[PDB]
């Protein structure tokens, strides 16, 4: 239509519908004015996000020790990059959309207009496609950005899409064409669910306190962002060798008999038999007899002697294999040398020698969870309990410098290493040298066979375990902390002086401690934080400073002379150091509220001057104009970070808070005001329904492409191969162009 309703601030240009060239002049003036207000909104929203960054950051005082007497003192601010902080920054960059929706609803006598909801759905489309494509492209070539936390991405993206799905539901499914008080109230109340989820994900889903910390220089004067990172000649018959060697767990040992010399075209018979030496038949090896036959043309025959495995430690033992009774069927063959083989069995049932890798280790305070390996050396037989504890040294740690931990490591059978996790508290110190200790106690063999329990003379209580080892049931010792049935437990409980020696060798194989039983852990300062502080101190009354920075290379001159009026006007905003950033917070959110009051007029009167509908001019112009802070915040988080969690998370949180507060608050106020008068609040669903369903269909395609770029050929969400990078960016921009063009046609009833 060509008739313009009066705005909140701007009056109607008169007369209406003057001519054709006058429409061109009026639309040109409104368009230039609206672009200039978009530049003003971008600058003031950048300052508003800087104030929010100031509020949610902890202030630290940095002492810089120097070799000379004078030591400089600095004050810095650390901003944690958490989900609860990123959703507040996304709320800060979503202030123009939220304020435009609320101001247009309240200013025009609580009547639903196309402008607010339409620029919010267009903001969803622009954020979801154009900003994500640009963040895909900006990442440097050869570098990849991957979402480490994929569950959080799934939940947040599903919630952000469900926001616009529920916008469809309240307008078309439940009482179509009418927004009730409960519908708008629940739409508003979904936002605290988002905030509580951000807090819970920070506490439990991420374990942010215990991730590796990286620090980067901020955009403000003293701000430092701390984020998650990756934590760094007749024939004769004789033995081939004459002495064979085997382990105890080999099962069988191979002995090679050779017939050599004489004539091969004959049959030879020779007997073999084992004899006990230090090792006894039936306990250490299988007693075997036999006769081997040498065929004509045959020279060597392999015989196999069984070795009995067990659980008891023993010394190196030996037994003898003899050959005898050389015969020839149908002298020609004799018993050669060596006629006797000595087979030696090495035991491997030592329960272990437990030690630390090094006596002293150096860790940074940003390590988060530190892992100390405890090694098991020279045997890994049985399950053993090794107590461990932390000892306070210079690092007085009860949550101050570290978290006290103590307990027991259980090494299973044939397990040769275990880890101890110690929680290191990060304090952001420029210079730190603290010391604590980690000690391990006497190991105890808690799980063994029954015969080993006889040989070790264990007098405790054993509960039979379902496991079977070397063909024997496995028994486990009962601890005092455990309360069993007391019918389940079994007490296993003049020696011939040979069995006494067997017990002594059995006790020689019990678990003991190694070289390093105490670890001295030295907590030191972060190199990344120290280098970032050095970068700050290399390059770093404030009321005067803002005005001096306001007015100060041809492209820089063009941008400076374009934005000098806005910078001079916004230099009257209080600096962020006042009121812990709240002084800048109160004024800027006022100023944004002013500049989205004019835009809501300028976007409206531009539409009716040339006959453009409010929905189309909100989708293509207002949505692109109010998402610029989201564009730069997502680009910075895509470039400077190591993961893609923050860049996509800003888009997703912005899409959620655009609905839950931008539409929720405005339609709650309108529904309550109309319900006070006993009348319904009527919203036309036809314009918004096609836009929100088109957004859902394109958003599922976007999420599918984002998940498909996780393959190792591409490697991650952002960046990656250049040829796939270009295709992904062009695909997403094409999705945005198709969305805005289809919605533009559909607004004019073309369907």
């Amino acid at each position, epitope marked *: 239509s060509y008739y313009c309703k009066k705005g909140v601030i701007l009056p109607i240009w008169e007369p209406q519908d003057p001519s054709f060239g006058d429409k061109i002049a009026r639309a040109t003036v409104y368009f230039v004015a609206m672009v200039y207000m978009f530049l003003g909104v971008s600058i003031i929203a950048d300052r508003f996000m800087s104030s929010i960054e100031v509020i949610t950051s902890q202030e630290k005082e940095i002492t810089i020790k120097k070799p000379n007497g004078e030591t400089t003192k600095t004050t810095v601010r650390i901003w944690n990059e958490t989900v609860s902080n990123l959703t507040l920054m996304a709320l800060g960059s979503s202030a123009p959309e939220i304020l435009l929706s609320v101001i247009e609803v309240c200013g025009h006598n609580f009547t639903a207009g196309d402008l607010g909801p339409s620029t919010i759905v267009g903001s969803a489309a622009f954020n979801m496609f154009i900003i994500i494509a640009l963040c895909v492209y900006v990442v440097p070539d050869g570098e990849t950005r991957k979402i480490k936390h994929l569950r959080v991405f799934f939940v947040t993206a599903a919630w952000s899409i469900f926001a616009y799905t529920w916008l469809y539901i309240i307008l078309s499914v439940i009482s179509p064409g009418v927004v009730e008080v409960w519908e708008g109230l629940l739409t508003f109340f979904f936002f605290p669910i988002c905030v509580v989820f951000a807090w819970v994900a920070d506490r439990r889903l991420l374990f942010y306190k215990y991730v590796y910390k990286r620090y980067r220089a901020g955009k403000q004067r003293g701000m430092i962002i701390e984020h998650e990172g990756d934590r760094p000649p007749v024939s004769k018959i004789f033995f081939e060798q004459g002495t064979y060697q085997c382990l105890e767990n080999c099962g069988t040992v191979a002995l090679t008999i050779i017939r050599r010399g004489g004539d091969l075209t004959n049959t030879v018979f020779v007997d073999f038999r084992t004899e006990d030496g230090t090792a006894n038949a039936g306990s250490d090896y299988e007693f075997t007899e036999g006769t081997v036959v040498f065929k004509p043309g045959d020279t060597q025959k392999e015989i196999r002697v069984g070795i009995i495995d067990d659980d008891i430690f023993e010394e190196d033992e030996n037994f003898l294999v003899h050959l005898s009774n050389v015969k020839v069927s149908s002298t020609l063959a004799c018993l050669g040398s060596p006629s006797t083989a000595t087979v030696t069995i090495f035991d491997d049932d030592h329960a272990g020698i437990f030690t630390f890798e090094e006596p002293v280790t150096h860790v940074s305070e940003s390590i988060g969870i530190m892992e100390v390996k405890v090694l098991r050396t020279s045997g890994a037989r049985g399950n053993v*309990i090794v*107590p461990y*504890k932390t*000892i306070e040294g210079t690092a007085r740690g009860g949550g101050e410098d570290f978290e006290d931990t103590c307990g027991e490591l259980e090494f299973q059978n044939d397990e040769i290493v275990k880890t101890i996790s110690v929680k290191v508290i990060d304090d952001e110190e420029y210079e730190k040298n603290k010391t604590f*200790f980690l*000690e*391990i*106690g*006497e190991p*105890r*063999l*808690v799980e063994m066979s029954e015969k080993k329990a006889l040989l070790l*003379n*264990e*007098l*405790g*209580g054993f509960t039979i375990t379902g496991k079977y080892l070397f063909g024997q049931p496995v028994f486990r*010792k*009962v*601890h*005092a*902390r455990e309360h069993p049935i007391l019918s389940t437990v079994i007490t296993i409980a003049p020696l011939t002086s040979k069995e*006494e020696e067997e017990r*002594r060798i059995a006790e020689m194989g019990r678990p*003991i*401690l190694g*070289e390093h*039983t*105490k670890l001295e852990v030295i907590i030191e300062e972060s190199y990344e934080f120290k280098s970032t502080v050095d970068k700050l101190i290399k390059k770093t009354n404030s009321w005067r400073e803002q005005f001096i920075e306001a007015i100060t290379s041809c492209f820089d001159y063009v941008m400076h002379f374009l934005t000098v009026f806005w910078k001079v006007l916004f230099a009257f905003v209080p600096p962020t150091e006042y009121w812990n950033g709240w002084a800048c917070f109160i004024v800027s959110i006022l100023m944004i509220g002013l500049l989205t009051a004019f835009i809501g007029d300028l976007a409206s009167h531009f539409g009716c001057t040339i006959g453009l509908k409010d929905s189309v001019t909100a989708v293509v112009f207002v949505a692109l104009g109010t998402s610029v802070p989201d564009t730069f915040a997502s680009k910075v988080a895509a470039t400077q970070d190591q993961y893609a969690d923050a860049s996509i998370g800003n888009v997703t949180g912005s899409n959620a808070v655009n609905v839950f507060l931008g539409i929720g608050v405005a339609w709650s106020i309108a529904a309550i005001y109309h319900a006070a008068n006993g009348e319904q609040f009527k919203v036309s669903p036809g314009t918004l329904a096609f836009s929100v369903t088109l957004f859902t269909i394109f958003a599922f395609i976007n999420v599918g492409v984002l998940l498909y770029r996780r393959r190792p050929e591409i490697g991650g969400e952002l960046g990656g191969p250049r040829t796939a990078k270009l295709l992904t960016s062009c695909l997403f921009v094409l999705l945005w162009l198709l969305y805005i063009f289809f919605s533009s046609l559909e607004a004019y009833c073309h369907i």
Partner: antibody
Framework: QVQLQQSGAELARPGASVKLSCKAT????????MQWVKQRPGQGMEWIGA????????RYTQKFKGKATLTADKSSSTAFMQLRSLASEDSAVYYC??????????????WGQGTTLTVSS | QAVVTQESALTTSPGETVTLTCRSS?????????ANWVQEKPDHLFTGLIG???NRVPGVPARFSGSLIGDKAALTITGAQTEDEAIYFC?????????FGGGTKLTVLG
């Protein structure tokens, strides 16, 4: 307030067997080791062994492996040390000592008052 | 099988500094021997003073310290009191047993 209280003076005939008690109070009995130590006049001190009552794990010297038996009664928080086949060398004073299980700490933290055992006829 | 050797007796005055020696037969006392120093007061009162060759039991007065000097463990008492008159034993941890020293009869004049 850790206290280890032992039994009184005891006399036994040669070739007999004796059981000696050491009741521990003021700390968790089952999570700590108990050292048993022998003292004779003019021969210094000899370490008989150690016991962990939580699992009833045992350590002994080779000389006292068959001579002494280490048992525990965790219901009454008591450790027992039993000597068999007594001889004239066995007339001594026996002590029990608390050990936390770690070698960096002291292995003989709190001692009992000592039990005097005399083997004569 | 090792034999730990100490001096027979040591004689000092109150306020002085005294050093007590723990020698191992097999060689040099190391940090893997975990030298314990314990104290016997008259009438069979035993107290554990220092363990792990450095660590001091809580409640022990601060004048007691343990260290390694040369190839032997050492107990240093700085400003010995008249109440420190006792018999001091040193226990060394070998591979599977503890060996106790002879015991120094430390006496303080009064």
């Amino acid at each position: 307030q850790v206290q280890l209280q032992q039994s009184g003076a005891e006399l036994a005939r040669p070739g007999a067997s004796v059981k000696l008690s050491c009741k521990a109070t003021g700390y968790s009995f089952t999570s700590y080791w108990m050292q048993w130590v022998k003292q004779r006049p003019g021969q210094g001190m000899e370490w008989i062994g150690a016991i962990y009552p939580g699992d009833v794990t045992s350590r002994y010297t080779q000389k006292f492996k068959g001579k002494a038996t280490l048992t525990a009664d965790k219901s009454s928080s008591t450790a027992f040390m039993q000597l068999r086949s007594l001889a004239s060398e066995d007339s001594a004073v026996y002590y029990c000592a608390r050990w936390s299980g770690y070698y960096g700490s002291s292995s003989f933290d709190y001692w009992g008052q000592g039990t005097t055992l005399t083997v004569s006829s | 099988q090792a034999v730990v050797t100490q001096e027979s007796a040591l004689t000092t005055s109150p306020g002085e500094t005294v050093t007590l020696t723990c020698r191992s037969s097999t060689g040099a006392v190391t940090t893997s021997n975990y030298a314990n120093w314990v104290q016997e007061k008259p009438d069979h009162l035993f107290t554990g003073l220092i363990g792990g060759t450095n660590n001091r039991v809580p409640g022990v007065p601060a004048r007691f310290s343990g260290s390694l000097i040369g190839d032997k463990a050492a107990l240093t008492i700085t400003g010995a009191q008249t109440e420190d008159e006792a018999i001091y034993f040193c226990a060394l941890w070998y591979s599977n047993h503890w060996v106790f020293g002879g015991g120094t009869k430390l006496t303080v004049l009064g």
